Amino acid sequence: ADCGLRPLFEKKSLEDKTERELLESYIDIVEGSDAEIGMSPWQVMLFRKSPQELLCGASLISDRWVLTAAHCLLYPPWDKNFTENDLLVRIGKHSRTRYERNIEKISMLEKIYIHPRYNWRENLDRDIALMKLKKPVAFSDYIHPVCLPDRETAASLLQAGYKGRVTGWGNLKETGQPSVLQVVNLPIVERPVCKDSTRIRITDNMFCAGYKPDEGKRGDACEGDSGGPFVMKSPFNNRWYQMGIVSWGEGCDRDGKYGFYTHVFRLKKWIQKVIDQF
């Protein structure tokens, strides 16, 4: 309703330091920079209760639902299979490790919903899951949901060359951990190029992003960034939309390799369905 309008930027008519770069591509984390306070109000941290550790990123889509990658909760080849009592969701964070008193809100999960057809056996196809919070979180200056794309938003923004933004507390190199939430703006890549960069079978529930080894700009999601949001700002209504979920990639920021994202619009029907089915 109020989705994708950040209290500290859109609302007060302030621009973050790199959004122009997004907007300028619509034809007007490794190697990221620190995010500004309240730059990604929908960024959520998937936290492990015991031991206490960051599991993945995630995003707030309403006051009671968090969107993340299914491989964040379930990956049988690595004996990964989290229950709602296994995790904690931390919202409104900036600092990676410190408990941001009076700023962040920590929530408990009521229910985890994995895509019934999430393909963990082969290529992480349909890598998405919903988590419904035990109680609605209260919005604030640092906590605010992102918008989910509609068919025509997906249509006009999801184009090769158009940049999106990925955020996370993930590794700083394939082989570093930030103290503060990192950002990187990356271009969407043509699907043939995506396909030609890997042996894994790319489905329509996916898109890849990153620069060309030739383009001379770098950046990528990395370990711990999983389940985080790939977002775009609509130049039509000025809102931030989540187009993708950090899914998989081979290494972090390797030349001729790209990050792969769950195609949120393709799976929006399943999202709606479970949201007003429960």
Partner: peptide, 10 residues
């Protein structure tokens, strides 16, 4: 690596 969180969260 993490600062402890309010016990009531666990």
């Amino acid at each position: 690596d993490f600062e402890e969180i309010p016990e009531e969260y666990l």
